[PDB]
Amino acid sequence: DPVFTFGLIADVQYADIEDGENYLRTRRRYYRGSADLLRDAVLQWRRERVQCVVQLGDIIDGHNRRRDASDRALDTVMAELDACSVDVHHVWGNHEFYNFSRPSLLSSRLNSAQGSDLIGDDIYAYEFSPAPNFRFVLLDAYDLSVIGREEESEKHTHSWRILTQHNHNLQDLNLPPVSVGLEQRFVKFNGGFSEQQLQWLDAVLTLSDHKQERVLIFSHLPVHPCAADPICLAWNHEAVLSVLRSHQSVLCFIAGHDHDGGRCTDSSGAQHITLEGVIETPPHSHAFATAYLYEDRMVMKGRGRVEDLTITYS
Ligand SMILES: [Zn+2]
Ligand SMILES: [Zn+2]
Ligand SMILES: [Zn+2]
Ligand SMILES: [Zn+2]
Structure with missing residues (x-):
């Protein structure tokens, strides 16, 4: 009998445009189909009576800006998500x-922060307890960007200095x-976590240790090299790992961004999960999950490109 049940999805990247590809032309991007996959995930989460959903970012594509359709694209995906109730x-x-700019994002439906949060410090990160003995932490992987x-x-x-110290392609930092x-990770489409943000995460985890909570951490960007392609890692991913490895309360670190997905267990026992991206999923496939937190384990039930996973608690 689960303590808490929640939906998970990454990189919907909806846009009302024809299918495209990634830069290297090795993956197709199914911009319109993403809304059909999202609608179906929502239908499934409704049947499951999930208690919340966490979506890992890139919910609409940057191409929307280029067609001056950012607001209508966001409206489209919000309408699908609102149906979950x-x-x-x-x-x-x-x-x-x-x-969108940060002030735009803060005033939008994408601000789910309303535990503790860093909004007053201009960092979009927050933490709360959804259920007894569990804590969710959402991080801002573009705090430094x-x-x-x-x-x-x-x-x-500061961020420009860090990026250009590692990447001399000033004409195209992507x-x-x-x-x-x-070192592939030092690109304009990535970012890092400020010292202020890491100090807060570290504090949250110290308190969780002493409360014997299990903590789930969510970030657009992955931080463990075993769980994602190097080009997709946070700029200061090792700084994050150093914090996580200090705390037994860490259950898992869940990210999107690398649409291929990945997963591994750190030597500490913490599970890293990088969710396969909806945008690179064709209509004959799928990519989402539902996670079940029990008293002794977490079970993630994946669909399509996302494989199931069980984490037995330490
Ligand atoms: Zn993406
Ligand atoms: Zn720095
Ligand atoms: Zn550096
Ligand atoms: Zn991304």
């Missing part, structure tokens, strides 16, 4: 920032500085 928690990813901060701000300048190894 439960709280939806929204992680902000790179495509959110391509479409050039795409999610205002030109001339302290944080944008191109990685190398083709092999972890």
Whole structure:
């Protein structure tokens, strides 16, 4: 009998445009079909009587900005999610920032923050307890970024210095500085977590340790190299791992961004899960899950491209 049950989905990236491809032309992007997959996920979550949904970001594509349709695209996906009739928690990813400024995002339906939060500090991160002995933490992986901060701000300048110290492709910072190894991550479509944000995460986890809570952490960007392609990792992913490895309360770290997905268990026992992306899923397939938190284990039931997973608690 589960303590708590929630839906999970990543990288819907809806747009009312014809199918496209990724840069390397190795994956197709099913922009319109994403809304059909989202509608079906919602139907399934309704049957399951889920208590909330967490969506891992890139809910609408940056192409919407280029066709001046950002608001109508967001309306479309919000209408599908509203049909579920439960709280939806929204992680902000790179495509959110391509479409909207932070003040716009804060005033929008994508602000699910309303535990503790960092909104007053201009960081979109928050934590709450959905059920006894469990805690959810949503992180802002574009806290340090050039795409999610205002030109001339302290944080944008800091982020630009970090990015361009590692990536000399000033003419197109979406191109990685190398083709092999972890330095690929230093691209404009990624970001990192500020010292302020990490100090807060570390504090949340210390308190969770002492309360014997199990903590689930959600981020648009993955942080463990075993769980995602290096080009998809947070800029300071190792700083995050160092925090997680310090705390037995960490149950799992769940991310989107790498549409291929990935998963692994850290040497600490913490599970990293990178959800397969809806946008690169064809209509004959699927990509979403429902997670069940029991007193002794978490079971994730995946559909289509997402495989099931069970985490037995330490
Ligand atoms: Zn994406
Ligand atoms: Zn820094
Ligand atoms: Zn550096
Ligand atoms: Zn992304």
